[model samples]
Target: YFQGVRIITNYGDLKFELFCSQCPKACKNFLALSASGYYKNTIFHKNIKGFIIQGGDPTGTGKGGESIYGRYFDDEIYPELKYDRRGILSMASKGAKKPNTNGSQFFITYSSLPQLNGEYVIFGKLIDGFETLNTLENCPSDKSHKPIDEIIIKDIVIHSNP
Candidate 1:
C-alpha cells in the first residue's frame, strides 16, 4: 500500500504516494517530519542541477540529526526501492559520523543517477510537478548546493491516494 505524499513548498510541488514499507524507519521519519510540519518554511538547502536536489536538514548545516532513540532498533533492510531514476526521494546519512543516522533529511534526483542507485535508501518518488525541483537546481547556490535565497516548504501532507 502506498502512503500518499505531497510536499507543498515555496518553490515547487512534489507528489509521492509509494511509501517504502520495507524501511519502516525511513518512512516513519519522513511521515513524522511531514506531520509536524517540520519541513514547512524550510529551505531546499541543496541542489545539484542535472544531478540531484537535496534538503530536509532542519539545521541546514549538513552536520546535524537525531538518531539516539534510546535502545535503538536493528537496521531494517530493503532492496526493491532503488535510487536509479529521477524524482526518487532518498534518505541522507551522516558521512563517517554514523550509520543509519538519517533524521528528516532527504534528496530528489533531477535525472537518472546510477551512482546512487545502490547506495542511498530511496523511499519515495515524485509523481507530480518536479519543475520546481529544476528551478531549485537552477537557483543560485553556494559551494555546497545551498540555495542563495532560502526556499520554504509550506507543508508536507501524508494522506492516501494522490
Candidate 2:
C-alpha cells in the first residue's frame, strides 16, 4: 500500500498519496517535516486561481524554508512521475545551484500542468478532498497572489507505513 497523509487546513482536510518508493528521499523529508511540526502554522503563501497553491515556508515568504536534510537536497525526479493533471504534488526549488535547490516548499496543481512535466520532482497527489483544494484555488487574492485571508495548515497526520 502507498503511504498517506491527511493535512488539516482552515478550509478542510486534504489526503495525499505519497510515492514512497519512487521518491524515497523526498518522502522522508516531507514526513519528518510534518512530524517535527515544521509545517505547523505555515500558510499557503501563493494561491493562484485554477493553477496552484504553494506552502511549507515557515516564514510564509515562499523562500524561507530548508530541506529536512539541511539547506538543500538533490531532486528526486524520476521520468515516470509527471505533472500530467491536477492534484500532482511537487517540491519547489529556485533553480539549479548544486544538485538541486529543493527545500520545504511544495505546490499542488488545480489543473493539468504540462510545462512542469520534466522540470520538477513530483512526489505525490491528492487522493482525497478535492473540494478543499477547490476552496483554496478559489480564494480571494491580490496582485501577489497571497490569499486575502490566510489559509493556514493547522495540522498534518502522516500515516506510518507498515
Candidate 3:
C-alpha cells in the first residue's frame, strides 16, 4: 500500500511518500484534510535556511490552524521515525516539552536535523519535487524568517493505493 502525496503549490508540486505503518494514528488528517481542501489556499509561512520550511497554517500567520477534527490532538511517537535526511515531513508540536501534541501544522526539512530527533513525528518524505523544495528553501524572507515571496499551497493531492 503506497500512499503518495502531491502538494500543489505556487512554487511547484512537492511530491512525498507518506509512511503510516509505524505511525498509523498520525496521518489520517494529513490525507483527509488535503483531499477535503482543508489545506487549500494555505501558505508556507516559515522558511528557515539550512533548517526546515514549515506550513499548513490556515491563518498563514504561523500562529493558527487546526486538524480535521479541530486542534489539540495527541500524536503517536514511534522511535524509528527520526529526522535523518532532507525533505523529512514532521508534525510541528504544539506548546513545548510535549512530544506529540500535533495538529495541522507541519514542516519539511531542508537538511538533516538530527538535533530535533525524537521531538517531532516524521510522517512523510519527499520522493520527488526536489526543485520545488529547493525553490522554497531559497525563497527570500524577512528577518523573521518568513518568506517574502509567499509560497502558497494551492492544494494537496493524496494518492492512496489501498
Candidate 4:
C-alpha cells in the first residue's frame, strides 16, 4: 500500500509520499502525530529563503515540539536519502550536539545542502505543491527569519492504502 501525507496550509498544499519501507519508525512517528491532529493550526516558526523552511512546533516558537513518544528518537539515516538536492524533507533537532534528537519539528530544503547529509533524517519529499513552498520561501521574515505574516498549517492529513 502507498502511504502519504497531505499538508493543507493557508499558503498552499503540499503532499508527500512517506518512505515507509526505508524509514518505518520516522514515518510512523509523523503519521501518528499527524493522525492525532498534533500539527493542526501550527505555524512555520522559521523560514530561510534559498535554504529551508522549518515548522511543526505547536508553540509557534522554534524551541518547542516533542516526539509522539514524548522524547527524542534515534536517527534513521539512509545513504540513498542524502541532502544533495532541494525539496528534501527532514526532521529538525536540537542541532550538532544532538544528531537523532528529533521530535515533531521538520524542515524542507529549498536549496542543495550536502553538509546536512548525515545530520538529519530524510522522511519524505515534496511530491506536489512546489509553488506553495516558493511562496513561503519568498514571504517576508524578521531578523530571526520568523515569517512576519502568519503561515499556518491548517491541517495535516495522512493517507494509507491497504
Give TM per candidate: 0.83, 0.94, 0.92, 0.93
Per-residue alpha-carbon lDDT of model 2 for 1-162, expressed as tens digits? 578998899999999999998999888999899999999888999998877889989999987999878998888877688777789988888643344788999889888887776677789999999988888888899899999999999977885546
TM-score (C-alpha) between model 3 and the true structure: 0.92
Estimate, for each residue in 26-124, the C-alpha lDDT of model 4 and write its tens digit.
888898888889899999988998889999899888888888777788789877987776688889986647777989998889988988887889988
Candidate 3 per-residue C-alpha lDDT over 15-74 given as tens digits, one digit per residue, 9 for 90 to 100: 899887866656887987777887899888888888998999889888887776667567
Clashing pairs in 4: none
- Candidate 4 Cα errors over 4 Å, as ranges: 160-162
Model 3: lDDT of residue 145: 84
Q: Candidate 2 — which residues are off by over 4 angstroms? A: 95-99, 160-162
TM-score of 2: 0.94
Instruction: Provide the lowest-lDDT 10-residue window in model 1.
Output: 67-76
Better by TM-score, candidate 4 or 3: 4
lDDT of each: 0.68, 0.86, 0.82, 0.86
Candidate 1 residues 1-162, lDDT tens each? 667688887776778855656767778767876787677766667777787767776676756445324222224435666655678887776431354555666778887776665566777788776676666677887887777787776788875642
Write the number of the candidate with greater lDDT, choosing between 1 and 4: 4
Candidate 1 pairs with clashing backbones:
none
Identify the runs in model 1 with alpha carbons over 4 angstroms from their true place. Answer: 67-77, 95-98, 160-162
